[PDB]
């Protein structure tokens with residue numbers, strides 16, 4: 001079934017704008033939305049088919065008090081995305097309240113696309129955590145979607161924000177988002193601003209314009225995570241089959257990301273596989289262990305190398321994991337596209353369930369716990385107090401995320417057979 | 421037999437003026453009605469033949485309190501339509517009374533053409549519902565025609581008016597027109613001002629001059645609805661032969677429209693069919709379902725593709741009839757004309773009996789019911805009161821249209837075998 | 841996934857006494873599967889047939905079709921009839 | 937019209953249906969060629985009345 005992407009918030013709208021542009025050039029598409037003449041791939045899932053080959057992405061763009069939003073509209077690709085479905089604070093509470101009054105028109109825009117498609121399998125959100133308007137509005141829309149569309153499976157390309165710690169309420173906003181995400185997301189793929197900023201400092205000298213350049217890094221991961229779905233394959237063609245292996249227990253649905261070519265701008269599989277297990281290529285910042293690992297390689301890979309390669313990574317043990325889940329690394333292979341350059345034709349990515357990401361969740365919980373005692377930034381803005389007089393959703397969120405922090409470490413232990 | 425079109429009222433006279441002009445260029449005719457030197461079609465039905473190839477269509481132009489009709493006369497096409505048959509309020513009652521005094525001279529103008537033709541099969545009215553002068557005069561002339569030609573059949577290109585709701589008596593005028601139209605019209609083809617205005621906003625930026633541009637949209641549908649008759653074919657070479665499939669029960673004789681390329685300014689048959697069933701291509705604004713669907717395609721269509729196209733549509737189920745009968749999508753095919761542009765080499769239209777149109781009838785019945793209680797606009801004009809002191813034709817109309825509203829929903833039910 | 845999918849709903853759902861072996865349903869699903877594959881509609885898609893060999897008395901508990909004899913049959917042209925031997929395509933069926 | 941017309945119609949309706957189901961059944965036995973039966977009930981009206989044997 002076709003996938004509908006609910007890109008929301010200024011930050012989320014920036015990475016959806018680029019992700020669709022990335023699949024414009026990668027696929028046989030043009031800024032008008034029509035196919036290029038020069039142009040064997042499965043464009044049905046991601047791109048709606050118009051009568052005159054105007055393959056329009058099924059993007060849902062949500063904006064709130066737009067000013068810099070108009071920049072997406074003044075672009076050569078404005079015609080490419082024309083489902084004609086765009087509808088008009090820095091606080092999590094401020095975003096949640098604004099979403100509630102406009103919920104029905106934004107929800108009808110969801111319906112239109114659902115009716116238009118032959119079918120709808122999942123809602124992929126370009127979510128921004130502690131995103132000012134992006135968070136709060138995104139949590140609320142996350143709660144409505146599961147109730148209305150229980151059958152579908154949701155994913156979140158959460159850009160978890162770590163900038164070395166401006167938002168003084170950033171921990172409070174993030175704390176609330178996770179309680180909803182844990183509760184109302186079937187899957188989440190985690191990314192980190194600092195981890196990518198550190199990569200940007202590593203591969204390039206770019207430091208001050210970190211957000212503009214890092215957009216390309218988030219994009220390469222995003223296009224890559226779905227390339228097996230976008231291009232024809234003998235296995236995991238459906239999104240669901242892919243999702244099951246990466247998330248073995250429902251609560252632990254957060255996925256770590258890595259790219260074998262930190263710089264993609266021959267190499268045998270035995271090599272490309274080993275790079276994913278080096279921490280310099282990872283993009284995320286008591287014993288600790290992965291729960292299950294998966295990898296997808298691109299290009300005309302030599303296959304015999306993989307049997308040697310898979311048995312080879314095994315002797316290397318570069319990846320240390322002994323979870324409750326069996327955790328064999330899974331090997332996938334896909335075709336690099338026939339439009340984009342063949343430089344570094346072989347290039348890989350890995351998506352894995354790792355207990356280390358628990359540490360990133362605890363750090364915002366640490367900032368929040370410190371901030372909660374001080375009550376330095378309760379906002380006490382009338383919106384914040386009137387929306388939350390008890391201020392007990394933050395405590396409800398704190399116990400739910402602490403259960404998550406606890407569950408992760410329970411995964412490390414030998415007995416996750418018992419309740420976690 | 422030749423078809424005589426009784427275009428009446430300023431709005432109706434505007435769409436007949438254009439429809440005849442549209443078949444002027446489409447057929448081999450100049451603005452003086454002369455056979456074009458540059459020029460395989462059956463012109464006998466729509467165009468009378470003069471000895472010097474003067475193709476004067478059998479148009480009957482009725483002008484009441486003329487203003488627009490003065491402009492039709494100052495046109496290059498004034499010579500093209502010269503049967504020399506044009507004869508001299510905003511209330512339905514005001515129009516009906518004016519028609520009654522001049523009924524015999526307008527009726528002799530009908531006779532002249534009937535005598536002149538080898539034969540006469542149907543009277544096609546460019547009717548305007550709640551058209552001020554156009555309604556009331558049109559209802560009365562609708563009643564006289566059936567009595568005089570009991571064997572003959574009457575069609576109505578009703579431009580049902582929906583402008584988001586100026587006429588304060590618009591619901592009252594429309595209410596009366598339908599009662600006459602339900603019992604005294606063999607067929608009716610429904611169009612909607614708002615539905616077309618929404619299409620105008622969609623395909624173009626035109627908003628303020630909605631009436632002038634929408635005339636072209638009503639015309640393309642009108643020329644197209646007759647192209648199977650105007651050009652010879654294996655099947656559907658008689659009006660009546662075509663009318664039977666579209667109207668299965670006499671009461672439900674209202675037909676919905678659609679055009680696969682609203683932007684007509686290659687495509688396989690499988691594509692042009694699927695595009696049409698989508699609701700953006702439709703031009704009309706409890707379970708609900710079609711009673712029987714039909715489609716006609718004019719372009720470079722492969723013959724064997726169409727029988728495969730029907731199978732593909734059956735699988736897509738984009739629309740399901742689910743009626744009491746064997747109603748099936750019916751594929752029909754015609755020749756696009758030479759001389760005029762062949763853009764959208766393949767381009768289609770659909771005429772269908774749909775229970776959704778009941779909703780549009782109920783909305784004017786809703787405005788009227790609300791208006792009837794208030795009695796805000798009883799007119800009480802002496803014409804209105806003297807013509808209708810009891811004001812019980814409106815109630816007679818209300819029960820007849822309510823029977824129609826009821827019959828439609830009965831069609832949706834599993835038992836229309838029982839009385840509806 | 842599709843040819844197997846429609847059949848599975850029916851096989852598990854019921855029609856277990858070879859009511860899923862109606863030549864009509866078998867052909868209907870096959871054409872449906874071929875059309876909906878999206879890899880393509882080709883002169884190559886011709887010679888594709890959905891068929892059965894051993895006849896099931898009834899489908900068993902768990903609807904295993906553990907050896908369900910549904911044989912995909914492929915016709916071969918005269919010259920390549922020599923290149924592709926009947927025994928050879930007999931083997932091809934096994935993986936299916 | 938209420939009774940005498942209905943009396944003529946019911947016998948013809950049964951006879952036409954009998955001459956119609958026997959025909960579609962005797963056409964269903966044969967193996968484009970089957971596009972005949974698929975098109976005749978494109979909605980699924982009288983999708984199946986009597987399963988033969």
Ligand SMILES: Nc1nc2c(ncn2[C@@H]2O[C@H](COP(=O)(O)OP(=O)(O)O)[C@@H](O)[C@H]2O)c(=O)[nH]1
Nearest residue numbers: 009010011014131132133134159161193211212
């Ligand atoms: N990855 C990425 N993150 C961004 C970018 N711009 C802003 N952000 C993140 O967006 C978050 C704040 O959201 P904000 O821009 O305030 O949303 P707003 O309230 O709509 O302005 C911060 O956590 C930033 O890390 C960008 O270009 N790339």
Ligand SMILES: Nc1nc2c(ncn2[C@@H]2O[C@H](COP(=O)(O)OP(=O)(O)O)[C@@H](O)[C@H]2O)c(=O)[nH]1
Nearest residue numbers: 429430431548550551552553579581613631632
């Ligand atoms: N489709 C279409 N409808 C029109 C146009 N002009 C007027 N109408 C319709 O005509 C109706 C009113 O008729 P009117 O023009 O008042 O007739 P008059 O009494 O002769 O002026 C309204 O319901 C309009 O929707 C036109 O150019 N196109």
